[PDB]
Amino acid sequence: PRKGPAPKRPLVNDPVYGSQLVTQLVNKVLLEGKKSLAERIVYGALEQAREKTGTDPVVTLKRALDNVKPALEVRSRRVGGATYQVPVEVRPDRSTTLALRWLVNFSRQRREKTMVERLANEILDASNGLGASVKRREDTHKMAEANRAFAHYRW
Amino acid sequence: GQKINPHGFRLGITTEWKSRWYADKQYKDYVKEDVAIRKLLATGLERAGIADVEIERTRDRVRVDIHTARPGIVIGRRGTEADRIRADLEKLTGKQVQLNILEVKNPESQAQLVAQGVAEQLSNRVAFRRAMRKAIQSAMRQPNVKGIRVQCSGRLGGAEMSRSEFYREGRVPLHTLRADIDYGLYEAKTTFGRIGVKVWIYKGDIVG
Amino acid sequence: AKKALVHKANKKPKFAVRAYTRCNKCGRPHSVYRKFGLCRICLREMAHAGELPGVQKSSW
Amino acid sequence: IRSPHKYKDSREHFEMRTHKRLIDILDPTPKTVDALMRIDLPASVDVNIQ
RNA sequence: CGGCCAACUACGUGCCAGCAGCCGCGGUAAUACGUAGGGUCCGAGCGUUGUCCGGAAUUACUGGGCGUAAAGAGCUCGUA
RNA sequence: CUAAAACUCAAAGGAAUUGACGGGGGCCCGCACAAGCGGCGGAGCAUGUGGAUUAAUUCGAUGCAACGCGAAGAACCUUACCUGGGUUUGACAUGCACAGGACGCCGGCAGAGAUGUCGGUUCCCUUGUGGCCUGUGUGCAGGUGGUGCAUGGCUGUCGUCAGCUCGUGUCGUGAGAUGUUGGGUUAAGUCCCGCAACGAGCGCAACCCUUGUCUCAUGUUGCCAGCACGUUAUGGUGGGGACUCGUGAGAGACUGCCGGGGUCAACUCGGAGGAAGGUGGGGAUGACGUCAAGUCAUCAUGCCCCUUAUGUCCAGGGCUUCACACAUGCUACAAUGGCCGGUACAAAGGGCUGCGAUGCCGUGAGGUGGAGCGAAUCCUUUCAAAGCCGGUCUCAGUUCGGAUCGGGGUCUGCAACUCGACCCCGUGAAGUCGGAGUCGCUAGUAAUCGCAGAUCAGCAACGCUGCGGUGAAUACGUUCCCG
Ligand SMILES: [Mg+2]
Ligand SMILES: [Mg+2]
Ligand SMILES: [Mg+2]
Ligand SMILES: [Mg+2]
Ligand SMILES: [Mg+2]
Ligand SMILES: [Mg+2]
Ligand SMILES: [Mg+2]
Ligand SMILES: [Mg+2]
Ligand SMILES: [Mg+2]
Ligand SMILES: [Mg+2]
Ligand SMILES: [Mg+2]
Ligand SMILES: [Mg+2]
Ligand SMILES: [Mg+2]
Ligand SMILES: [Mg+2]
Ligand SMILES: [Mg+2]
Ligand SMILES: [Mg+2]
Ligand SMILES: [Mg+2]
Ligand SMILES: [Mg+2]
Ligand SMILES: [Mg+2]
Ligand SMILES: [Mg+2]
Ligand SMILES: [Mg+2]
Ligand SMILES: [Mg+2]
Ligand SMILES: [Mg+2]
Ligand SMILES: [Mg+2]
Ligand SMILES: [Mg+2]
Ligand SMILES: [Mg+2]
Ligand SMILES: [Mg+2]
Ligand SMILES: [Mg+2]
Ligand SMILES: [Mg+2]
Ligand SMILES: [Mg+2]
Ligand SMILES: [Mg+2]
Ligand SMILES: [Mg+2]
Ligand SMILES: [Mg+2]
Ligand SMILES: [Mg+2]
Ligand SMILES: [Mg+2]
Ligand SMILES: [Mg+2]
Ligand SMILES: [Mg+2]
Ligand SMILES: [Mg+2]
Ligand SMILES: [Mg+2]
Ligand SMILES: [Mg+2]
Ligand SMILES: [Mg+2]
Ligand SMILES: [Mg+2]
Ligand SMILES: [Mg+2]
Ligand SMILES: [Mg+2]
Ligand SMILES: [Mg+2]
Ligand SMILES: [Mg+2]
Ligand SMILES: [Mg+2]
Ligand SMILES: [Mg+2]
Ligand SMILES: [Mg+2]
Ligand SMILES: [Mg+2]
Ligand SMILES: [Mg+2]
Ligand SMILES: [Mg+2]
Ligand SMILES: [Mg+2]
Ligand SMILES: [Mg+2]
Ligand SMILES: [Mg+2]
Ligand SMILES: [Mg+2]
Ligand SMILES: [Mg+2]
Ligand SMILES: [Mg+2]
Ligand SMILES: [Mg+2]
Ligand SMILES: [Mg+2]
Ligand SMILES: [Mg+2]
Ligand SMILES: [Zn+2]
C-alpha cells in the first residue's frame, strides 16, 4: 500500500443466477475452505427463504442489501492526548461489503437451532426491517449523527 | 559464521571431487579406512607440505596420488620414505597400494603450500608483517595469478589478546560462481598456543 | 569421546542389544547417519572439503 | 544442522544423484560379450552384466 | 636495571604483603612487589633529606598580554 | 567598597574534527500502522524450562538473538551422577631394560558380576631377533577435572538491510575534508546532469538449481494413435512414437516495437505480439565490523590440577522426582457437526541379516506360512483423507468431548515394578469461544484435510524434514505505535 494502490482481483459471476452478489456471499460465508459445502448452504438457505416468503430471491436480496447498506462510518484518532471519534463517508463498494459482513455476522448469532434456517430468517428480518443488521445500522447512523461535531478534522 | 567453504560452494562447477568410486554395501568401511589413512599420512608427514591427496579405488585395488612442492624428501633416492609409507599402508590394510608422486608446476600459486610456509615462518620467529609482505610479493610475481588475500587470527606476538587482520591486493570475487578460487588453510604452532591462517587465490575465469 | 569407551564399544558386547554407532572419525554417540557411518559435523566437513564421493549442495 | 550445540534455526541440505542407464543388447555374440568383459571403465561408472 | 633514563631472565605471594620524582604498577601466568643470578653507573666513597640558582620568555627594561582561555573600571568632569 | 592566610588538587581551560544521541527538522522504506482472515492468553493432554525436594535427579544454554534448545530416539550400554564389590605401567598405544616362548582362543566350578581356579591348542622366522603379550619398573598411558575474560575451527543476530574503503590530486598546520555533496530516477553507492576531482576494490545485478512453453534425439520394467488374440483382470499378450512419461541438446524477455511525458538523458504511464513485461515464481548466495555473543561435553590446543586417584570393570538406582510458575504444540468446546452404509480423484520417498504377497485363525493388536525384490517390474493396500449420495441425533454437559482410575491379551527385548508402545472392556471428570495484553499472514497466500523419510529391534514423535487435496477476504492512505 505504501508504494500505491494494489490491483483488485477480477471476481467471476455466478452461473446459476448471474449475480456476483451470490458469489460474494458464498465467499464471505466460506469457513475452513469448503467451497462446495458453503455453496450448498447458500443455495439451501435461499430456497428456504424463497419458499417461506413466496417472492423472488434475488429481488428480496437486493431489497435487504439496499435497506441495510450504510452511508457514514466512524473513525478513531487521538489529538492532544485525547482520543476522539471522527465520522467520514464510505464508498458504495465498501458499503456493500460491510452490509454483507454484517448480514453474515448477525446470522451467526441467532437461536433457531439450525444455521440453514437462521440465515434465511435473518435475510427475511433484514428485508422487513426487523433485522439485527438493521439495528446495527441504526446504531451506526446514531453514533455518526451524535459525533459528527468533530467533522472539521476531515481525516 | 560468516562465509561458507569456497571449495564446497563451487564443487559442482569449477572444482571436482578429491576421490571418486562407487560403493554401497561397504561404503562405511571405505570411508573409515580412507579417513584413517589420510590422518596417518597427515601425522607422519610434516616436513614436506602435501598440497593435495587423491585416492582412486576400483574393486580391491586402491590407487593413491600425492602432490608435493618437492619430492626430494617425500620419496628418497633409495626409497626410505617410500617403503616406510608402503609399510604403513600395509599395516592399515589397504590391500595392494600404488604410490604416485607428482610435483606441482608452481609452488607459490598453490594455496596450501603458501599456507604451510607462512605458518612455519610465523611459528619459528618471523614477524607477521614481513611474512605477509613477502608472501604477497612472491604470489603476485607469477603472471597467472590475478588476485590474492591472506588472513590470520589468534595470539599475534604473544599479546594477551586476539587480533584478526588481513591484506588484500587484486580481485577476490567470492560471490561470483564463474570465478575460480583456490581455498586453503593451516594451523601454525607456537609456544603460546595455536594460530590459524587462511588464504584466497583468484586465478582467471572459466567459460564452458 | 573417551578412547577407553570408544574402544570398549568397538569390542564385541556380551549381548546383541548393547551395540550402537559411535561415529568413527570422532566417536560422537548422538546424531549419526547409518549409511555413511559419520555424524553431522563430520559429514559437513567431508562434504565441504569435497572428499566424499557423491555429496553436493542441494538447491531445487 | 548448521552448527553444533543448539542454534537449530539454520540448517543445510545435501543431495546425492545417481544416474542409471539401460543398454538392452540383443543377439549376444560371444565376441561382443568378451569385448564387454575386457573393456575397462572408470571407477565412477559401475557395469552390471545380467 | 616500565618511559623520561646507559642497564634482563627465572623463582615466591596475587586489589593481600608492597614500590614510586611525574606518568603509574599487583583481582593466578609482574622485565614496575621480595628473592636469585646476569647487566649498567659509581668507588674510598655510594645513596636519602634540607637550602639557593638555571631550564621558567613562569613579573617578560634587554624579553608577555586583556572578543571567546586571567585580565578594559558603568560613563563623565577634573588636582598632582 | 578596599581585601588576606592555612589546606587540597596534576588538572581546570579556549578553538575546532569523526561518531553517538534528541520526547529537533526535512526526505524515504518494511505485514509497522490502517482495512481483513485465522490464532495465543480460559479446560484436558504431549514436550522444554524455572522453582522445592532427593544420595544422585550428569553438563551447557538464560530478552530480542535460550526455553518440541545440544538429545535424528535415557530397562542394560547410552551416562560423564548416587550406592556397593574389585582393579592396578593400568581398559587402551609406544621406547628402554630385567625373566619367556606364548599371547591369544574354546568349556567346567564359585560369585550381583566384574573377576579367581581348573579342562584343550600354542608360537611364524632363525640364532640376531622382529610380531605378541604374561610379571618388576623405567619413561608413560589415563582425565566429559578447571580456564570460550588466553586461543583454533564452527554458528546466530544487527540484515539479505545497502553500505564500507583505497591509489593520485587538491584545501587546511592539525585532528582532517573532496571524491561519497545538489536535482531527477530505481528494489539497490543502479544510472544521467555540473561541480577539484580523476579511477579502482569489497558489496548490488548477472554467471548456478528448480518451476512455466516449444523444437530435435528418444521406446523398456513406461504410454497407446491405428491393426489381431484376450473373454473377465486390467496393454494382459503380438505390435507401434502418432502425444504425456522419464533424461540429453537447443530456442524463448532484451523496454523487443508503438504513442505521451521527460534536459533528448536516465526513467516512467498506456498499447500490440507473446506462456509470461518491465528483477515471471522460489531456492543456494551473509561486505568491513558490533554483541569479550554460544561452544575447553565433536575435535584440536597454552597453563594449573588427580596419578594409587577426580583413571578403570561390573550389579542396582537416577537423568521420567512435586503443594507451584512460564513457553511451544495436539484434542475440543458441537448441526459448515458426531456416528453408520455406498462411492472417485495425487505427489514424492524406502526396502539385506530388510520390505513383506495369497491363504488360514483371531473384534484387533497380532499367531502360521511366506511368492516377488538389492528393486519404473515386488511390498509400502488398486497411496489415501476432506469430497458426493442415504439414515439417526433436535440443542442436553449431549450419540460432542476424551483424560483419570480397574479387569484381560499381542508384539521386540537375557532384561517392561521406578520405566515403552499397541489391542479388548468398565470408568465419564474440567471445558458453552474466553480479562487487560499479545502473535502469524498480501496468492496458489490464509485456513482446513492426508502421505513418506532421517535417528530406530521395541518406542515417550502431537517434534523436524519433505510431498500433496479443497482453497478465501482486504489494502482508502502514511496523522499516530516499532525498526
Ligand atoms: Mg539401541
Ligand atoms: Mg549420532
Ligand atoms: Mg625498563
Ligand atoms: Mg633503556
Ligand atoms: Mg626499587
Ligand atoms: Mg607469577
Ligand atoms: Mg622491585
Ligand atoms: Mg646485577
Ligand atoms: Mg678519591
Ligand atoms: Mg635563564
Ligand atoms: Mg642548562
Ligand atoms: Mg626568568
Ligand atoms: Mg602568557
Ligand atoms: Mg588593547
Ligand atoms: Mg575568560
Ligand atoms: Mg566588565
Ligand atoms: Mg566600558
Ligand atoms: Mg580629565
Ligand atoms: Mg567547546
Ligand atoms: Mg543529536
Ligand atoms: Mg512484504
Ligand atoms: Mg491491526
Ligand atoms: Mg490458545
Ligand atoms: Mg493456555
Ligand atoms: Mg508437544
Ligand atoms: Mg539441567
Ligand atoms: Mg520459552
Ligand atoms: Mg526461558
Ligand atoms: Mg523448534
Ligand atoms: Mg550399568
Ligand atoms: Mg582436559
Ligand atoms: Mg581431571
Ligand atoms: Mg567442564
Ligand atoms: Mg558459557
Ligand atoms: Mg547498520
Ligand atoms: Mg599542505
Ligand atoms: Mg563532507
Ligand atoms: Mg562523486
Ligand atoms: Mg557513506
Ligand atoms: Mg566524507
Ligand atoms: Mg556499487
Ligand atoms: Mg547477487
Ligand atoms: Mg495401448
Ligand atoms: Mg559485517
Ligand atoms: Mg565469550
Ligand atoms: Mg561471554
Ligand atoms: Mg583444544
Ligand atoms: Mg571417573
Ligand atoms: Mg539416569
Ligand atoms: Mg530431562
Ligand atoms: Mg483435532
Ligand atoms: Mg465412509
Ligand atoms: Mg480377523
Ligand atoms: Mg480405497
Ligand atoms: Mg466422551
Ligand atoms: Mg472426537
Ligand atoms: Mg466446562
Ligand atoms: Mg450451554
Ligand atoms: Mg480484549
Ligand atoms: Mg521410534
Ligand atoms: Mg500442501
Ligand atoms: Zn563424527
From Swiss-Prot, chain A:
GO terms for biological process? translation
Going by the entry's taxonomy, the superkingdom of the source organism is recorded as: Bacteria
Stated name of the protein: Small ribosomal subunit protein uS7
The record, for InterPro entries, names: Ribosomal_uS7, Ribosomal_uS7_bac/org-type, Ribosomal_uS7_CS, Ribosomal_uS7_dom, Ribosomal_uS7_dom_sf
Question: Family assignment?
Answer: Belongs to the universal ribosomal protein uS7 family.
Keywords, sorted A to Z = Ribonucleoprotein, Ribosomal protein, RNA-binding, rRNA-binding, tRNA-binding
Name one cellular component (GO) term. Answer: small ribosomal subunit
Q: Which organism is it from?
A: Mycolicibacterium smegmatis (strain ATCC 700084 / mc(2)155)
Keyword Phosphoprotein applies = no
CDD domains from the UniProt entry = uS7_Bacteria
Q: How does it assemble?
A: Part of the 30S ribosomal subunit. Contacts proteins S9 and S11.
Main function: One of the primary rRNA binding proteins, it binds directly to 16S rRNA where it nucleates assembly of the head domain of the 30S subunit. Is located at the subunit interface close to the decoding center, probably blocks exit of the E-site tRNA.
Q: Which Pfam families match?
A: Ribosomal_S7 (PF00177)
Supply one GO molecular-function term: rRNA binding
Chain's gene name: rpsG
UniProtKB/Swiss-Prot annotation, chain B:
Q: Which residues form the KH type-2 domain?
A: 37-105
One example of a Gene Ontology biological process annotation: translation
Query: Mind listing the UniProt keywords for this protein, alphabetically?
Result: Ribonucleoprotein, Ribosomal protein, RNA-binding, rRNA-binding
Query: Among its keywords, does the record have Ribonucleoprotein?
Result: yes
Asked whether the UniProt record includes rRNA-binding among its keywords, one would answer yes
This protein's GO CC annotations: cytosolic small ribosomal subunit
Q: Which family does it belong to?
A: Belongs to the universal ribosomal protein uS3 family.
What else the UniProt entry mentions is:
Binds 2-aminothiazole antibiotics, which are antitubercular agents.
Outline what the protein does: Binds the lower part of the 30S subunit head. Binds mRNA in the 70S ribosome, positioning it for translation.
Name recorded for this polypeptide: Small ribosomal subunit protein uS3
Task: Record the organism.
Answer: Mycolicibacterium smegmatis (strain ATCC 700084 / mc(2)155)
Whole-protein coverage range: 2 to 209 of 275
Swiss-Prot record, chain C:
Query: How many cofactors are bound and how?
Result: Binds 1 zinc ion per subunit.
Q: Which GO terms describe its molecular function?
A: rRNA binding; structural constituent of ribosome; zinc ion binding
Needed cofactors, names only, are: Zn(2+)
**Positions bound to Zn(2+):** C23, C26, C39, C42
Q: Which Pfam family is an annotated match for this chain, by its short name?
A: Ribosomal_S14
Q: Please give the coiled-coil regions recorded for this protein.
A: none
SUPFAM superfamilies given in the database record: Glucocorticoid receptor-like (DNA-binding domain)
Key words of the record: Metal-binding, Ribonucleoprotein, Ribosomal protein, RNA-binding, rRNA-binding, Zinc
Q: Which GO terms describe its cellular component?
A: cytoplasm; small ribosomal subunit
Q: Which domain of life is it from?
A: Bacteria
Zinc is among the record's keywords: yes
**Record-level GO BP terms:** translation
Role = Binds 16S rRNA, required for the assembly of 30S particles and may also be responsible for determining the conformation of the 16S rRNA at the A site.
The record's listing under HAMAP family reads:
Ribosomal_uS14_2_B (MF_01364_B)
> What does the sequence similarity comment in the record state about its family?
Belongs to the universal ribosomal protein uS14 family. Zinc-binding uS14 subfamily.
According to the record's subunit comment, the protein's assembly and interactions are: Part of the 30S ribosomal subunit. Contacts proteins S3 and S10.
Protein name according to UniProt:
Small ribosomal subunit protein uS14B
Q: What is the lineage of its organism?
A: Bacteria, Bacillati, Actinomycetota, Actinomycetes, Mycobacteriales
Gene name, Swiss-Prot/TrEMBL: rpsZ
From Swiss-Prot, chain D:
Disulfide bridge map: none
Q: Which family does it belong to?
A: Belongs to the universal ribosomal protein uS10 family.
Subunit-structure text: Part of the 30S ribosomal subunit.
Its biological purpose: Involved in the binding of tRNA to the ribosomes.
The molecule here is called Small ribosomal subunit protein uS10
> What gene is this protein a product of?
rpsJ
Q: Which residues of the full protein are shown?
A: 52 to 101 of 101
